[PDB]
Design a protein around this ligand. Structure first.
Ligand SMILES: Cc1cc2nc3c(=O)[nH]c(=O)nc-3n(C[C@H](O)[C@H](O)[C@H](O)COP(=O)(O)OP(=O)(O)OC[C@H]3O[C@@H](n4cnc5c(N)ncnc54)[C@H](O)[C@@H]3O)c2cc1C
Ligand SMILES: Cc1cc2nc3c(=O)[nH]c(=O)nc-3n(C[C@H](O)[C@H](O)[C@H](O)COP(=O)(O)OP(=O)(O)OC[C@H]3O[C@@H](n4cnc5c(N)ncnc54)[C@H](O)[C@@H]3O)c2cc1C
Ligand SMILES: Cc1cc2nc3c(=O)[nH]c(=O)nc-3n(C[C@H](O)[C@H](O)[C@H](O)COP(=O)(O)OP(=O)(O)OC[C@H]3O[C@@H](n4cnc5c(N)ncnc54)[C@H](O)[C@@H]3O)c2cc1C
Ligand SMILES: Cc1cc2nc3c(=O)[nH]c(=O)nc-3n(C[C@H](O)[C@H](O)[C@H](O)COP(=O)(O)OP(=O)(O)OC[C@H]3O[C@@H](n4cnc5c(N)ncnc54)[C@H](O)[C@@H]3O)c2cc1C
Ligand SMILES: NC(=O)C1=CN([C@@H]2O[C@H](COP(=O)(O)OP(=O)(O)OC[C@H]3O[C@@H](n4cnc5c(N)ncnc54)[C@H](O)[C@@H]3O)[C@@H](O)[C@H]2O)C=CC1
Ligand SMILES: NC(=O)C1=CN([C@@H]2O[C@H](COP(=O)(O)OP(=O)(O)OC[C@H]3O[C@@H](n4cnc5c(N)ncnc54)[C@H](O)[C@@H]3O)[C@@H](O)[C@H]2O)C=CC1
Ligand SMILES: NC(=O)C1=CN([C@@H]2O[C@H](COP(=O)(O)OP(=O)(O)OC[C@H]3O[C@@H](n4cnc5c(N)ncnc54)[C@H](O)[C@@H]3O)[C@@H](O)[C@H]2O)C=CC1
Ligand SMILES: NC(=O)C1=CN([C@@H]2O[C@H](COP(=O)(O)OP(=O)(O)OC[C@H]3O[C@@H](n4cnc5c(N)ncnc54)[C@H](O)[C@@H]3O)[C@@H](O)[C@H]2O)C=CC1
Lengths: 285, 285, 271, 265
């Protein structure tokens, strides 16, 4: 009865949203010939979905800044899509950052994901610095379950407001598996007067061990039912993929029904899962 | 809020049912060396799930009866699992059927899926004939959306009652995608005084074109959202598999919450999807 | 509540093209009603119903068959007729292309079914009463009679109109567990005139739910609102019935096509 | 227990003028809490809106609220107009911006003139020009904080959309009533045009329901009344006790819908 009809309604609603969802994909700089090939294969397949934009990460304190910039250029040259480099300020001086920013702008890179990076400058300072350089589109990190270093949930929330007030035109969340946490956070952002959309960062899980490691380092809660779902699958990649896709598809269906029309996917350079999740959202070639 | 909490509750409930679900798998006689290999690979993998039983189909009017019996023997000899041959009465005389039945019993085959088969004997007649031969475990076909040849839903329902009264100890449904139809049918079976469990026959869909063909021939309704879900995937087998697994997993989660503790899977000789669906039900090696 | 409504409406939209409908008419008593009736026939015919029937007549049936070609099934009662004449009329119909006959009493219906059977292989349709026929001594008794009529050869059963959906559903559940293997086709009475409808009800022992009485309260002089409210009630009823598996509907048009036509439209039954 | 309001538009032809007054007489018997009259910048102007408001008041004694926008109007002009309306007994105004001062600026301006009862527009499916859903919700809060006494929503056909929106409003601390604007549909072509211009979602089952009825007004009316009655029934079950009807100057449908809600003469 209830559970059945609820499913049908949720499913039909999702079907009718086709054509109204905006998506973006996050990639990281390949470290090997194999990953390089995989990445470009993924870029080609996901580019057909016409994402609002794609972004490329940059490991803070890595000194591999050139890799990020190189990938960004290649993406623009091959797809004509807007590619946003992630830029951290914890490992660079204001002068270096202004130089880096000016170069991006002159190279046609007009969207930057401004982050602080892990341990004189916090992300909000980078946002201001970037806005002084040029009228950049700026995306910043949001934490539904609170950044692990925040003094309080209130402080972390106020910090997001600070970043938006400084010029950030959108917020992208750390991944989460507790859907209610995201929804509650979205309401709190309204209460704090934040007027930008809080874009959910979605992590499709095929490798649970890896996800649990990411999660444990970021204070993200993995529900008991999810841990039980992946238990016993250490050596079953096929079942992990099916189970993970089911989880992600369930997640975006509920989010879509709650009015979310923008999704950012942590692809980890693989396209299969994100491509299928987008398919269910009506985002097709 | 609502949709979110409902998901969490459904998911947690499913997690807690681990160890209480009975499953069975249906296979068909391979027609080529390739399918033969695939089938035994699937048998080996699904056998580790300890199914209550497995069954092997027999195409009515095919004259390939020996193929079914051969596969059944091989399964018993290799796994030690109960293997139930499907037996049709539309293409054999009572004498031939009694002979066939006696041979099965003497060969250790004590469970038969008694069916009529497509066009002097209806399935109910076969049930009676089988019970006279020996004390067989007998499974019969049930149709939540009504068999296409029934004079009415009432007649088809009364026919199921006839089969049970004649000796059938369980009913297995034709596949369905409208979960409410199964639930309503289960309630009607109670109203008709049928005291056996109505086991849902689950069809995990990876090939939509094939499923639609099966469905159109059997009066099974494919919801509009499901047709839209597979639209545009004719040449994308990977996405079809992920989408189909999501549908099947959603289906058994809702069924499980409604008290269903028995599931029969139409594997079409492939194990991957059914194996993963069983994993979500807590049915693991 | 909201989601369930969305699910019900969608499932209804998908049943489009699989529901069978039939329309019941009555012989006109005036030139005006003659005009109205045939206009309805032309209108409702475009919906290609499984069949249409005329209360008891033979002429109207012929005209319908000659004008639309639809299976016109005339009603037949046991009153004012002898078994001899019955067989005569029965054979008179079958010999005129009339294959479907709604056997009614008005010497019971069962005997009428048996008689038509012993004459030819007609498609017999009898009456069913979800709220028990007023004359019947008991619910079970009237129930067994229906079975007797079905056993006698009644192909399908058509219920007296009703407004309490649960009553029809409970009755259908008792019909199956009673061994009746025919579909209990719900007879739908779209209400535009509450006074007239309440009259029929009090004459057939049909219950008018309190909510229905309240819904029509104060509309004696508001035909417009009555029609919208009645169409709504009939709409909701067939929607719920459809979700319960009912794929056959019989409409008591009272020779008017507007409402029945609209209700069919929502069931996917369109030209 | 349930309060209703009706919205009308200034007639532009003699035929529509007759229709409107017939509808006013019919609907006034239901004693609505108030009725409102829309404004068409290039389709009637403020004088026509005002004329109808005055006529309704004189003929029925009902509270009539003009829809007042601030496009191509100066603050001084708006103050002069509001003062005149107040002095003439018009004490409820539906304050709007109008398509391209924001509505919140008008609310403030009006409250400075007098203690007007003020209603503002709300969008369950977000105003088309809003930066985001969050920004549109914060704007509604700004309008309420500026003095708006209630919010009236753009029409919708996805009931859950309205329910989820109402919940977000409450979470945001918006304490006034979020009154659903109901559009009974008898002309689907016209409704779809309205919807396509305002980001309002039309469920698949609904589009399907009106398919093939382009030249069948009778069936459209019966089908649309069913949809509307179904909608208000669910909304009522969910705690809604105020409905605003987009009559499009016709009374039959809204009258019947109110009847089912127990709102009768
Ligand atoms: C969408 C997304 C993409 C990412 N991509 C990358 C990437 O490519 N490379 C990489 O290195 N990292 C990346 N990260 C990780 C990120 O850099 C870390 O989470 C980092 O520790 C914080 O960065 P931030 O931009 O959130 O910092 P901030 O917004 O500055 O927040 C960090 C902490 O400082 C606190 N804070 C802010 N201002 C003050 C103040 N004045 N005093 C005290 N505390 C204060 C905050 O509450 C918080 O606890 C990403 C995160 C997200 C969610
Ligand atoms: C779990 C499952 C497994 C199957 N496996 C196979 C297989 O291996 N091989 C194969 O050939 N087919 C198979 N089928 C398909 C099946 O044989 C067809 O659906 C067939 O047309 C009916 O078989 P049945 O056993 O349901 O027949 P029955 O139960 O006899 O029903 C068939 C029809 O006859 C009607 N009926 C019954 N008694 C009477 C009566 N006395 N008078 C009039 N009508 C009556 C019923 O209402 C129904 O419409 C399977 C179906 C299911 C659901
Ligand atoms: C679809 C429909 C169409 C109709 N069309 C017409 C029409 O065209 N013309 C017309 O004149 N009337 C018509 N009627 C009304 C009908 O004729 C009356 O309801 C009438 O009272 C007889 O009903 P019946 O045909 O069910 O007879 P029956 O089926 O014989 O049942 C009537 C009563 O007799 C009782 N009963 C049956 N057998 C016995 C027995 N052996 N001993 C004692 N009690 C017994 C039953 O329980 C019941 O109370 C229609 C009704 C319906 C529902
Ligand atoms: C009940 C109802 C009745 C209506 N009646 C009429 C009528 O009679 N005549 C007519 O012409 N129109 C009418 N409208 C249509 C309305 O005028 C349009 O929707 C118009 O485009 C916006 O009006 P508003 O009052 O909602 O403006 P606002 O509430 O000002 O909203 C308009 C947009 O501006 C945004 N916004 C608000 N403040 C700011 C800011 N400071 N910076 C940036 N963006 C901001 C909002 O989020 C929104 O996208 C009606 C609408 C409703 C729902
Ligand atoms: N939340 C996010 O989107 C990201 C967070 N980070 C954080 O910064 C640290 C340093 O980055 P790297 O030098 O690349 O470390 P790394 O080399 O371990 O990570 C490689 C890549 O994996 C992906 N990844 C890693 N952690 C992730 C996370 N928590 N969420 C989503 N994607 C993730 C990113 O694409 C990252 O570039 C990471 O260990 C992580 O803590 C880094 C990139 C993205
Ligand atoms: N419902 C069921 O479980 C089955 C139904 N059937 C019906 O009997 C007919 C004849 O059988 P075959 O000679 O094998 O035809 P076939 O050669 O086309 O089918 C081969 C196999 O595919 C699977 N299959 C086909 N239709 C199916 C269905 N509707 N549901 C679940 N599995 C299905 C069965 O394992 C079947 O043995 C089929 O076309 C079908 O209509 C046959 C087997 C199973
Ligand atoms: N339930 C039914 O389908 C029918 C019931 N009857 C009833 O049997 C008696 C004799 O019939 P008439 O001389 O035609 O009476 P009548 O002259 O009052 O009725 C004329 C026609 O209106 C329709 N009608 C009348 N009552 C109805 C009802 N309760 N339900 C559905 N349709 C109805 C029928 O088409 C009937 O032929 C009357 O009491 C009449 O109401 C007659 C025909 C059909
Ligand atoms: N949401 C509302 O209640 C209203 C919205 N508007 C919108 O403002 C803009 C300018 O208006 P006009 O030039 O008069 O357009 P128009 O000339 O197409 O509209 C004429 C009249 O029809 C009614 N109407 C039109 N759109 C409606 C809607 N979406 N919802 C309810 N009633 C509606 C109103 O009474 C309006 O005065 C248009 O986009 C129009 O849709 C105008 C009046 C009311």
């Amino acid at each position: 009865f209830f559970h059945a009809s609820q499913r049908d309604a949720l499913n039909q609603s999702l079907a009718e949203v086709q054509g109204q969802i905006n998506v973006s994909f996050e990639f990281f700089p390949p470290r090997t010939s194999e990953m390089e090939q995989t990445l470009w294969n993924s870029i080609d397949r996901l580019s057909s979905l016409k994402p609002k934009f794609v972004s490329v990460t940059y490991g803070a304190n890595s000194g591999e800044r050139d890799r990020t910039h190189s990938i960004i250029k290649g993406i623009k040259d091959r797809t004509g899509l807007e590619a946003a480099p992630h830029l951290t300020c914890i490992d660079a001086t204001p002068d270096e950052l202004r130089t880096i920013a000016r170069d991006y702008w002159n190279n046609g890179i007009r969207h930057i994901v401004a982050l602080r990076g892990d341990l004189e400058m916090y992300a909000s300072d980078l946002v201001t610095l970037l806005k002084e350089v040029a009228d950049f589109d700026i995306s910043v990190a949001a934490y539904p379950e609170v950044h692990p270093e925040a003094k309080s949930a209130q402080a972390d929330l106020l910090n997001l407001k600070r970043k938006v007030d400084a010029g950030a035109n959108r917020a992208i969340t750390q991944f989460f598996f507790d859907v209610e946490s995201y929804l509650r956070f979205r309401d709190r952002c309204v209460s704090a007067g934040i007027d930008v959309e809080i874009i959910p960062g979605i992590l499709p899980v095929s490798n649970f061990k890896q996800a649990k490691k990411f999660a444990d380092m970021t204070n993200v809660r993995i529900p008991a039912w999810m841990a039980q779902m992946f238990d016993g699958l250490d050596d079953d990649a096929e079942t992990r993929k099916l189970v993970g896709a089911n989880i992600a598809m369930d997640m975006v269906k509920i989010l879509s029904r709650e009015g979310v029309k923008d999704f950012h996917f942590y692809t980890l350079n693989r396209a299969e899962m994100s491509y299928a999740i987008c398919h269910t959202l009506g985002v097709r070639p």
